[PDB]
Amino acid sequence: MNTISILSTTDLPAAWQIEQRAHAFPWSEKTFFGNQGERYLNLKLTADDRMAAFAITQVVLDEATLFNIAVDPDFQRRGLGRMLLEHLIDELETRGVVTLWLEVRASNAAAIALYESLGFNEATIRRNYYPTAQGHEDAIIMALPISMKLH
Numbered sequence: 104m105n106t107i108s109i110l111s112t113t114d115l116p117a118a119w120q121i122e123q124r125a126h127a128f129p130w131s132e133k134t135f136f137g138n139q140g141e142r143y144l145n146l147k148l149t150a151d152d153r154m155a156a157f158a159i160t161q162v163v164l165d166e167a168t169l170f171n172i173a174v175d176p177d178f179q180r181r182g183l184g185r186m187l188l189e190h191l192i193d194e195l196e197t198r199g200v201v202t203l204w205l206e207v208r209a210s211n212a213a214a215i216a217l218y219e220s221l222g223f224n225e226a227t228i229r230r231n232y233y234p235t236a237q238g239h240e241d242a243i244i245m246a247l248p249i250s251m252k253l254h
């Protein structure tokens with residue numbers, strides 16, 4: 104079974120393992136352990152007693168930023184990234200959040216396709232914002248409008 108839940112202190116070591124195997128340009132550890140607590144809505148997805156994925160999000164006013172989503176390589180291309188994001192989007196809506204923002208590497212083909220498929224729109228481009236092995240890469244800033252439901 105696939106269980107989506109709040110990512111809490113105890114979950115962080117396993118999440119850091121996912122961060123390090125999934126991200127082609129991983130955060131540092133200090134940054135990773137710093138994106139928790141006040142105004143963070145952080146989620147994990149548990150596939151049969153193993154963490155499969157996590158997502159780091161911050162809520163300010165009626166907007167939010169997805170700072171990070173990652174599915175462990177063992178669990179990728181199985182639909183779990185989408186399911187985790189979908190559950191986050193639902194939760195944001197119940198919190199009154201009208202827009203989810205993110206930035207992504209222009210070459211992260213897989214991430215962009217997930218986002219586009221969920222209805223993210225390119226908003227703005229930051230040229231050569233991301234460091235690579237040899238030079239730089241653009242950052243694509245994307246926004247997802249989340250329309251209001253009845254409760």
Ligand SMILES: CC(=O)SCCNC(=O)CCNC(=O)[C@H](O)C(C)(C)COP(=O)(O)OP(=O)(O)OC[C@H]1O[C@@H](n2cnc3c(N)ncnc32)[C@H](O)[C@@H]1OP(=O)(O)O
Pocket residue numbers: 125126127169170171172173174175178179180181182183184185186205206207208211212213214216217220
């Ligand atoms: C704001 C940020 O965090 S940007 C950083 C994003 N995270 C990373 O780059 C970490 C490394 N990558 C990952 O962890 C995963 O690849 C994720 C998060 C991008 C996607 O998770 P997955 O679970 O693999 O994706 P999932 O299976 O749900 O598939 C989602 C969709 O993405 C697309 N997609 C996913 N992987 C790929 C791929 N490798 N190539 C092309 N398209 C892909 C497809 O649209 C797929 O949807 P489909 O059902 O329409 O065929």
